[PDB]
Design a binder for these strands. Structure first.
Length: 125
RNA sequence: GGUUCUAUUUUGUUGGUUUCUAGGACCAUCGUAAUGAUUAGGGACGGUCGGGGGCAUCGGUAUUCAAUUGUCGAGGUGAA
């Protein structure tokens, strides 16, 4: 209904999850599809870029009803849902958008990056 | 007994002239003969650099908490 011709998307990609939403050019959503929303949860068997491509592709089905052309992605973290490889999966979503009738606008890396990169130890909550 | 005059020396005091001696303030230059390529200390004037200091403000990103919308499972690990 909205017919917002471009919009942003943050690709969240933690170790188990790879949902892909695609919002408009202002902020409010219209469509997000979860990894569990693509039927699977089995914790260890959630990692790879291969099953993560399917969850990110079912986004395009309901995104059709609005009609977003250029999806401008912001990748946060790297992981996804698995059928094969343990480890990365955030590269999956970019392939899903590119294979559908949706277009890529720009690729941005939007991560909380510290200066020195360790795991934290030393101080409160 | 001593007085008086004259000459000389010494001590104190005063004045003109001649000659000689102490003491106080401030500043220039570094010459050459006795260890041999020496501007050794403090700055004033005029430009200049820096995350040196303390305080008072201000801005941005990320995280967390609280409230509200759209949307249904996640987080961890070598497996758990």
């Amino acid at each position: 209904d909205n017919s917002q011709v471009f919009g942003v998307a943050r690709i969240y990609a933690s170790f188990n999850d790879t949902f892909v939403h695609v919002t408009d050019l202002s902020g409010k959503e219209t469509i997000a599809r979860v990894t569990g929303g693509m039927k699977v949860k089995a914790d260890r068997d959630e990692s790879s870029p291969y099953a993560a491509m399917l969850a990110a592709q079912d986004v395009a089905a309901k995104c059709k009803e609005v009609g977003i052309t250029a999806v401008h992605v912001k990748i946060r973290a790297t992981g996804g849902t698995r059928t094969k490889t343990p480890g990365p999966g955030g590269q999956a979503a970019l392939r899903a958008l590119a294979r559908s009738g949706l277009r890529i606008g720009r690729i941005e890396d939007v991560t909380p990056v510290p200066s020195d990169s360790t795991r934290k130890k030393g101080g409160r909550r």
